[PDB]
Amino acid sequence: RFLKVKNWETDVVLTDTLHLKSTLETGCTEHICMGSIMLPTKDQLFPLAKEFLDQYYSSIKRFGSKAHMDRLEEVNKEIESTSTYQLKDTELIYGAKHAWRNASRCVGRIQWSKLQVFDARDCTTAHGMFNYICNHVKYATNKGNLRSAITIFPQRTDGKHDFRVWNSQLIRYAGYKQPDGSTLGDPANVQFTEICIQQGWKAPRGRFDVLPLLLQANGNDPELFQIPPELVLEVPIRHPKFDWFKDLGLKWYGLPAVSNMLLEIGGLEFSACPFSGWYMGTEIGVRDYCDNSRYNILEEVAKKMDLDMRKTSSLWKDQALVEINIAVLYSFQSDKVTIVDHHSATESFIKHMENEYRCRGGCPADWVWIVPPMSGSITPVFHQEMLNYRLTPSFEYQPDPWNTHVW
Amino acid sequence: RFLKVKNWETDVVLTDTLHLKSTLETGCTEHICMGSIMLPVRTKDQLFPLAKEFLDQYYSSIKRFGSKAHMDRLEEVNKEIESTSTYQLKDTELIYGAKHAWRNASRCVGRIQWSKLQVFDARDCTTAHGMFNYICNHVKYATNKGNLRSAITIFPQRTDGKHDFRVWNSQLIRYAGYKQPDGSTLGDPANVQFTEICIQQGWKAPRGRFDVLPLLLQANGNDPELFQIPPELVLEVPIRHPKFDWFKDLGLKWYGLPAVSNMLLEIGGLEFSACPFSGWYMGTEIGVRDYCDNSRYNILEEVAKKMDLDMRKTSSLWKDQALVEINIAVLYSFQSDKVTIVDHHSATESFIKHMENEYRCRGGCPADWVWIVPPMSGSITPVFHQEMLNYRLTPSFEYQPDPWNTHVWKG
Numbered sequence A: 001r002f003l004k005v006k007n008w009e010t011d012v013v014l015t016d017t018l019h020l021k022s023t024l025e026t027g028c029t030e031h032i033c034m035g036s037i038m039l040p041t042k043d044q045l046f047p048l049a050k051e052f053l054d055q056y057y058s059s060i061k062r063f064g065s066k067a068h069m070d071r072l073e074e075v076n077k078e079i080e081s082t083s084t085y086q087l088k089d090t091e092l093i094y095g096a097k098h099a100w101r102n103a104s105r106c107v108g109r110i111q112w113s114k115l116q117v118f119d120a121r122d123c124t125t126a127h128g129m130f131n132y133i134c135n136h137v138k139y140a141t142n143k144g145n146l147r148s149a150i151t152i153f154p155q156r157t158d159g160k161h162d163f164r165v166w167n168s169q170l171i172r173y174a175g176y177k178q179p180d181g182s183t184l185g186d187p188a189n190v191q192f193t194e195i196c197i198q199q200g201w202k203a204p205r206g207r208f209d210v211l212p213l214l215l216q217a218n219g220n221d222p223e224l225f226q227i228p229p230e231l232v233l234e235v236p237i238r239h240p241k242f243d244w245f246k247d248l249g250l251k252w253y254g255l256p257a258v259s260n261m262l263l264e265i266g267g268l269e270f271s272a273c274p275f276s277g278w279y280m281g282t283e284i285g286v287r288d289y290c291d292n293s294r295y296n297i298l299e300e301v302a303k304k305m306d307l308d309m310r311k312t313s314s315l316w317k318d319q320a321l322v323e324i325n326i327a328v329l330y331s332f333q334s335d336k337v338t339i340v341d342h343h344s345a346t347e348s349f350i351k352h353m354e355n356e357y358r359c360r361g362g363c364p365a366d367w368v369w370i371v372p373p374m375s376g377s378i379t380p381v382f383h384q385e386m387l388n389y390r391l392t393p394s395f396e397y398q399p400d401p402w403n404t405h406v407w
Numbered sequence B: 001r002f003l004k005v006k007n008w009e010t011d012v013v014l015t016d017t018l019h020l021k022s023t024l025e026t027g028c029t030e031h032i033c034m035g036s037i038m039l040p041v042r043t044k045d046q047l048f049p050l051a052k053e054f055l056d057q058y059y060s061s062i063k064r065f066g067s068k069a070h071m072d073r074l075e076e077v078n079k080e081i082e083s084t085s086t087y088q089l090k091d092t093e094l095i096y097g098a099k100h101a102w103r104n105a106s107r108c109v110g111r112i113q114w115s116k117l118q119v120f121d122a123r124d125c126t127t128a129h130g131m132f133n134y135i136c137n138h139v140k141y142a143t144n145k146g147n148l149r150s151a152i153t154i155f156p157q158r159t160d161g162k163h164d165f166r167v168w169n170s171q172l173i174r175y176a177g178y179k180q181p182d183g184s185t186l187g188d189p190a191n192v193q194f195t196e197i198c199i200q201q202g203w204k205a206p207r208g209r210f211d212v213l214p215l216l217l218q219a220n221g222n223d224p225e226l227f228q229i230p231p232e233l234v235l236e237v238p239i240r241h242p243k244f245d246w247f248k249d250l251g252l253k254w255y256g257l258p259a260v261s262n263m264l265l266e267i268g269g270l271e272f273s274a275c276p277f278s279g280w281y282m283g284t285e286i287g288v289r290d291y292c293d294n295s296r297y298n299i300l301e302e303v304a305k306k307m308d309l310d311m312r313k314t315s316s317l318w319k320d321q322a323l324v325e326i327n328i329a330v331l332y333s334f335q336s337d338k339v340t341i342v343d344h345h346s347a348t349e350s351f352i353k354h355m356e357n358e359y360r361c362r363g364g365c366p367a368d369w370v371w372i373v374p375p376m377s378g379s380i381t382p383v384f385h386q387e388m389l390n391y392r393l394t395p396s397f398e399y400q401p402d403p404w405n406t407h408v409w410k411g
């Protein structure tokens, strides 16, 4: 019932108890582990609120206080009446910070308590949503000195009045399907790049076109808005060695702002809650650039390095993969845009784990995602045993809106 | 109950039914995943159904399920169990069992080779000297002058747990590690404890950086004995780099034959506690883990200095850079000396094919993503994007406690 995790590089053992407060399910059973699978009423509502308020009041050392007891009946009454309830701002902020704190797949959680929370629950229209989103982008971007942020739009009522940001991230590059067979721009967004057109977007059918926002307020049809370019910070990618690197014509945006997840707090569902932090270098250089189903520039780069690509055994891909990532980090740092390398981030996470085990009794973590997509075993997290379990408040995945939307 | 895995690079979706045949537990539950936890005397009572499940398996594979040969064998094993409290496997069953334990090994990326396994039956062995002989023959057969051949040598099964055969070494061939008084380590840090045992057991350590450890062999529950593998049987490869000429001067070499010797092989409820086995190296085992783990030879810095990398910021990825070059060297040296090795791209690619074949011909393929994905360049190998299901089938290879921790000393 009380669990030990060992780090095999340092022999340090930690003891986990936090998992005992887990309420949601993993997907695994005693007969089968699903650790590498990508995606596994007033009745329901009241214990959920209670559990949350219990956490919350415990966290401010007023467990079993009048304020506590009072808030509990107050919420209970409101549920009885309205069949839902509203969070106080303090609870909203606490809830959002803790959804981040509990995100078992996020290596960046040492920053969790410094989250700027923007309350957009008063928002009613797609234009309103756009305004709030532009403000988020400008604040978080902060001229390159990035600051984490989340903007929280009104909670689900009857699932027919949902607020949804249709983009997967606030800022992403378009992808169009060619006659040449392949794909210009970003293959991951070919379908979304299509749906923008299907609703009226004018694509400059280029390679790195910042996609428009597709905003759904209150269950209505979504609307197109162009993010002001002066708000979209971008970074041109050059190698501090290969002077030819620049002619590949690569750039990337500085702000990673995931916009399609669901924030759950005390049973309440926030279907539109775009949030942002800053990039770990490998996200762009390894995944975005070198994934086969993405920008897939490995061959091209390798050509320009005149490497022996005759056999897998020369490790040409590996050699190039490193240089590319050196360039990403180089470009960002030179342009003074916040970025972190996988060594620093993982080092920070181990420190964060130590802290969480110490002050909270543990830290849910998904090794499959915490370990970076390159040079895994030379980062400390590779040798770190981790326990994965689901805590609430949480960020959850949710179905793409075009599949659900009753037009 | 059917289960689907998706490859997110190819959208290829597969359906697992094999997981239904799983008996053993994973460690995980509905509320916690232990997927990254490293390591998470049996009665006639529980033995028979285990024998029966094995024998049903075996007779199905040979397409004789429900035959009279099947039924008589079950009867024979039943009688032998209740009479003697255990039973002996036929050679055929032993071979089938060893192959399938390999086949069921969810953490092994090399399983496409599982059906080509040379099984050496050492169940007639009675002494440590006998064990040394068998092991020498294994090493010689498996090495084959550099054209490596997979093999397993199987010593007598456990009886009352007081008469175990064990190979105390973790691998048949490994380098000594020596802790110095100044706290530094000479040789392979991983083998310090084992090196000390050997020394205490009377091994004269030459105390160099690459000393092949002696074999420490336990027969029939007796105290273990020391033997030196004949040097001419130990194939080694000097490590050089195809472009960096200073690399040779780092003084590195490695042995060609990876031969894990401390696992327990389980077949039909019988436990084979000494079953050393060998295949060949995937390059990163040596180039990434053995050389570059901080708790191993840890040569990243010295390599990095000599390539003149910016070692001032991690952000320069000097570590990543040196890591690749070292792995380039390992592959280069082995191929140059015609010693079988496989790069991580080739191995992972072959595994994906194996896996798909296994889903179709067998209904599934248990696989441990945490272990299948290579320790460098993870996402540019196809396994990274492959959803996998992990579950335990028998026959299987299992860990067992280190024998110095359990052994009852006779003196």
Ligand code: HEM
Pocket (backbone or CB within 6 Å): A100, A103, A105, A106, A107, A108, A109, A111, A115, A148, A149, A150, A275, A276, A277, A278, A279, A280, A283, A340, A345, A369, A395
């Ligand atoms: C501030 C610096 C941050 C860094 C360096 C960082 C890093 C990462 C990385 C590398 C991943 C792996 C995802 C992938 O490879 O696609 C991840 C996942 C994730 N991050 Fe963080 N992140 C940061 C901030 C945040 C913030 C501010 C939030 C929310 C408020 C957040 C929530 C999440 C969630 C929910 C996931 C996984 C989603 C899932 O369940 O699959 N992160 N992060």
Ligand code: HEM
Pocket (backbone or CB within 6 Å): B098, B102, B105, B107, B108, B109, B110, B111, B113, B117, B150, B151, B152, B277, B278, B279, B280, B281, B282, B285, B342, B347, B371, B397
């Ligand atoms: C023939 C070439 C082979 C290759 C390239 C190969 C590759 C690997 C690799 C890279 C690992 C990961 C272990 C680590 O990184 O420490 C592994 C694990 C494993 N292999 Fe293979 N292997 C081969 C042959 C074999 C054979 C012949 C057997 C048994 C008959 C076997 C049984 C296992 C088992 C049981 C594990 C899990 C080890 C553990 O959980 O500690 N392998 N293999």
Ligand SMILES: CN(C)c1ccc(CNCc2ccc3ccc(N)nc3c2)cc1
Pocket (backbone or CB within 6 Å): A038, A039, A108, A168, A256, A258, A276, A277, A278, A279, A280, A283, A397
């Ligand atoms: C299941 N599925 C189809 C899927 C999986 C992953 C993704 C990509 N978002 C992962 C993420 C989240 C938050 C992040 C925060 C900061 C950062 N620097 N990076 C972050 C990256 C999209 C879709």
Ligand SMILES: CN(C)c1ccc(CNCc2ccc3ccc(N)nc3c2)cc1
Pocket (backbone or CB within 6 Å): B038, B039, B110, B258, B260, B278, B279, B280, B281, B282, B285, B399
């Ligand atoms: C602490 N722990 C549980 C642990 C972890 C790793 C190891 C290292 N041996 C793993 C192995 C097994 C079989 C192999 C077969 C062929 C090959 N080319 N390589 C193989 C590598 C030992 C023990």
Ligand SMILES: C[C@H](O)[C@H](O)[C@H]1CNc2nc(N)[nH]c(=O)c2N1
Pocket (backbone or CB within 6 Å): A008, A382, A383, A384, A385, A386, B035, B036, B037, B038, B370, B371, B372
């Ligand atoms: C804690 C963690 O599970 C442990 O370090 C594992 C990770 N994956 C691995 N994968 C392989 N192939 N070999 C290993 O030793 C490990 N170690």
Ligand SMILES: C[C@H](O)[C@H](O)[C@H]1CNc2nc(N)[nH]c(=O)c2N1
Pocket (backbone or CB within 6 Å): A036, A037, A038, A368, A369, A370, B008, B384, B385, B386, B387, B388
């Ligand atoms: C199949 C597998 O689960 C999938 O490729 C995962 C593996 N680990 C990952 N890790 C991170 N950080 N991001 C990812 O998208 C993935 N993808």
Ligand SMILES: [Zn+2]
Pocket (backbone or CB within 6 Å): A028, A029, A032, A033, A034, A035, B028, B029, B032, B033, B034, B035
């Ligand atoms: Zn699991």
